[PDB]
Amino acid sequence: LLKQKILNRESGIITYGITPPKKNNTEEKIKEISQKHIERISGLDIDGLVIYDLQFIETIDPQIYSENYLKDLKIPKIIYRCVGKYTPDEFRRLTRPVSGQDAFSVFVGAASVLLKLSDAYKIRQDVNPDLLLGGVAIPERHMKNTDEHLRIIDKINKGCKYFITQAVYNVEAAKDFLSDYYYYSKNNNLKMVPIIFTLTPCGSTKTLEFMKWLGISIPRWLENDLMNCEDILNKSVSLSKSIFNELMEFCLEKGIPIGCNIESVSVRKVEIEASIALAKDIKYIM
Amino acid sequence: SLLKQKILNRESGIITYGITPPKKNNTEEKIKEISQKHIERISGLDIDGLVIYDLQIETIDPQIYSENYLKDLKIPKIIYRCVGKYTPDEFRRLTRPVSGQDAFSVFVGAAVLLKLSDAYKIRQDVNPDLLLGGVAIPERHMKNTDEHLRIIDKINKGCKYFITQAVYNVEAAKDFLSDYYYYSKNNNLKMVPIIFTLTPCGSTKTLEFMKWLGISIPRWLENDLMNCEDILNKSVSLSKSIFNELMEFCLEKGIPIGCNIESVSVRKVEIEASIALAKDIKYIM
Ligand SMILES: CN1c2c(nc(N)[nH]c2=O)NC[C@@H]1CNc1ccc(C(=O)N[C@@H](CCC(=O)O)C(=O)O)cc1
Ligand SMILES: CN1c2c(nc(N)[nH]c2=O)NC[C@@H]1CNc1ccc(C(=O)N[C@@H](CCC(=O)O)C(=O)O)cc1
Ligand SMILES: CN1c2c(nc(N)[nH]c2=O)NC[C@@H]1CNc1ccc(C(=O)N[C@@H](CCC(=O)O)C(=O)O)cc1
Ligand SMILES: CN1c2c(nc(N)[nH]c2=O)NC[C@@H]1CNc1ccc(C(=O)N[C@@H](CCC(=O)O)C(=O)O)cc1
């Protein structure tokens, strides 16, 4: 389902996204956390499950978390790799094809390293041409030099067949990126790959500082409301939905294949329950 | 008539008929008679467009022929230009758009007053809405296997379709199509319509002209001709067979394919064979 959507460059891809727990936790806490992820996510209708990688918070390896903890979830997993964490020989090994299974992955370069991103892309070309590779796109970064479309075209050239954005909190940056992506592709006679927009609810100052650490900002107006002790969680979701709806419209008009990834980044029941509900609402919309 | 939409929609099924304007030396009444015969036969065709060749013998200018003798034919005209015969300034003048009217042109380089690369830049500057096509030569693919790259590069410079020279070798054409398809698939490119030219050959006179244009027929075919056999039908039959094979290959891979039936002969029998073939190809596609 997911593999085909991606190979045929279709709209409508929908994924949910989680970060594995800390390594620190007892072996029993993990299985509980893990069984909770399984119960709620198995209740969705998604094409795949993104599992993030971070580069004090050291989380379970995304692929190990996938295989050894989440096998009961019968959907593909998109395994993120902060390649700079891996020596080039670890990276060759992790990228090897395994007989009788597909593989989905997003290679993430340095936010600011034992292995550079250009090198990781060629290591993949060497060892597993069939790995369904995605790239990270950052619409906010397009405001600074109007070349994030060019950055993702260079990633397409390097093997990428889809892009998953960080959390989108600004519709104009996102439409500006989509625009320059559409027009450049058209002018250079290119086909387009799926642009998967991530939505990430934010319901506490705790969630927010994790988000800032990931490089995600929310609007100053919204943060202001949080620092002045209002509940922003529902305004998160409403603003996120608003944004995605406008992007889905912009994308229909121009035939840009668009997907959505609903990211759950909080340790709080209420916020996690908001993510799950957002993931259901998004399916309904598209 | 649907021609622009088929081009812009990258559709299969473009069919055109192809003529070279008569010699410049014939008289205004004789050009009018030649032109009346053309309009008579070609108006009996269901085609998308009439290709009008430019030679780099001296023949009436194709745009001038189209506009002042072929008004009666209600179909778009694809104006060939051997850019090398025109100065950079005269080319600007001819490229300029005409109000409420689509322009179609194939720019041909040298086998010169203007380089082809500069002719493309002139189109970019003076008329971006000119529906521009390129010559593709499958036979030449067998030299270095890079004709597909030649055309990709022409697409980059503004071409939106390709009209090959007369096809007589199905394997070279299929090799060119194959590499075009696969290179397009792997570098994320859309494909543009490849219009294959079929050109009946009925006499040594037709052949010497075709040879001068850079076209060859198969040795076995030319052998029968030089041994005084009528090859007109054989050349048509072969042309049809090649195109059926190319259509099948193209349909399987989703490659947009068209056909241009070229008449290149002064002999009535060869001209009627070309008309017939045009109607045959339409039926086939
Ligand atoms: C998307 N990220 C992310 C996550 N985990 C969660 N939960 N959420 C996230 O958004 N883990 C990986 C990354 C963490 N943050 C970031 C943010 C930006 C870049 C970044 O600028 N990436 C460029 C690299 C530039 C380079 O060195 O070439 C890239 O294209 O990958 C990397 C990591
Ligand atoms: C490393 N992670 C992490 C983070 N954010 C913070 N602040 N801390 C973290 O350790 N973001 C990503 C990931 C999330 N980790 C976890 C760990 C446990 C539970 C968990 O115990 N879930 C219960 C708790 C309900 C509640 O506390 O309200 C559940 O019901 O789902 C959730 C996410
Ligand atoms: C297609 N041609 C043609 C015609 N007229 C008729 N009737 N039939 C034809 O096939 N007029 C123009 C051209 C004459 N023959 C030729 C054959 C090859 C090239 C050629 O190789 N063209 C390259 C140019 C490369 C360069 O400029 O170096 C091209 O891309 O156009 C040009 C003219
Ligand atoms: C410059 N041209 C030309 C050539 N080939 C040769 N050898 N000489 C040429 O001058 N090929 C292309 C173009 C064709 N010119 C012409 C000129 C006149 C008629 C013509 O009078 N057609 C009549 C004659 C029929 C007959 O001779 O039996 C007709 O019935 O259509 C056709 C093509």
User: Hey, what domains does chain A have and what are their CATH numbers?
Assistant: 1-286 (3.20.20.220)
**Tokens at A195, concatenated:** 């642009």
Distance CA B236, CA B208 (A): 18
Q: Do residues A41 and A49 make contact, with C-beta atoms less than 8 angstroms apart?
A: yes
**B41 assigned binding-site residue:** yes
Distance CA B259, CA B48 (A): 10
Ligand with minimal distance to B59 CA: 4
Chain A: closest CA distance from residue B95 (Å) = 21
Q: Do residues A50 and A260 make contact, with C-beta atoms less than 8 angstroms apart?
A: no
Distance CA B195, CA A188 (A): 22
Distance CA B94, CA A226 (A): 66
Ligand 3 neighbour B135 (Cβ under 6 A): yes
Pairwise CB contact (< 8 Å): B156 & A190:
no
Give the Å distance between the CA of B275 and the centre of ligand 4.
Answer: 14
Q: How far is CA B225 from CA B89, B209, B231, in A?
A: 45, 15, 6
CA atoms lying within 13 Å on the CB side of residue A186: 10
The residue length of chain B stands at: 285
Amino acid at A264: S
Ligand with minimal distance to B34 CA: 4
Pocket (CB within 6 angstroms of ligand 4): B 20, 22-23, 34, 37, 57, 59, 205, 209, 264, 266-268, 271
Residues 6+ apart with CB under 8 A from B182: none
Q: Which residue's entry shows tokens 């727990």? A: A21
- Tell me the three state secondary structure of residue B72: coil
Q: Do residues A110 and A140 make contact, with C-beta atoms less than 8 angstroms apart?
A: no
**B240 assigned binding-site residue:** no
Distance CA A57, CA B41 (A): 81
CB proximity B156 to A under 8 Å: yes
Question: Taking CB atoms and an 8 Å cutoff, what residues of chain B touch A189?
Answer: 155-156, 189-190, 192
Q: How far is CA B269 from CA B17, B183, B203, B263, in A?
A: 17, 42, 10, 11
**Tokens at A106, concatenated:** 């997003």
Q: Do residues B250 and B11 make contact, with C-beta atoms less than 8 angstroms apart?
A: no
Give exposure, A183-205, as e/b (b: 16+ Cβ within 10 Å).
Answer: eebeeebbebbbbbbbbbbbbbe
Distance CA B272, CA A275 (A): 72
Mutant choice from B188, B191, B192 vs A, greatest count of A C-beta within 10 A: B188
Q: Do residues A265 and A207 make contact, with C-beta atoms less than 8 angstroms apart?
A: yes
Residue of A nearest to B159 (CA): A189
Ligand 1 neighbour A19 (Cβ under 6 A): yes
Structure determined by:
X-ray
Q: Which of B266, B269, B271, B274 to mutate to test the pocket of ligand 4 (most atoms within 8 A of CB)?
A: B266
**Tokens at A123, concatenated:** 């290591």
**B126 assigned binding-site residue:** no
Q: Which atom of ligand 1 is nearest to the CA of A118?
A: 28
CA atoms lying within 13 Å on the CB side of residue B164: 31
Residue of B nearest to A188 (CA): B156
Amino acid at A132: L
Task: Say how many C-beta atoms besides its own lie within 10 A of residue B32's C-beta.
Answer: 12
Partnered with residue B106 across adjacent β-strands are B80, B133
Q: Which atom of ligand 4 is nearest to the CA of B33?
A: 21
End-to-end CA distance of chain B: 17
Distance CA B220, CA B209 (A): 19
Ligand with minimal distance to B54 CA: 3
Distance CA A144, CA B210 (A): 58
Q: How far is CA B141 from CA A36, A106, A273, A284, B146, in A?
A: 61, 39, 61, 52, 6
Distance CA B53, CA A96 (A): 56
Ligand 3 neighbour B112 (Cβ under 6 A): no
Q: Which residue's entry shows tokens 């971070």? A: A54
Sign, Cα dihedral of B57, B63, B65, B68: negative
CB proximity A7 to B under 8 Å: no
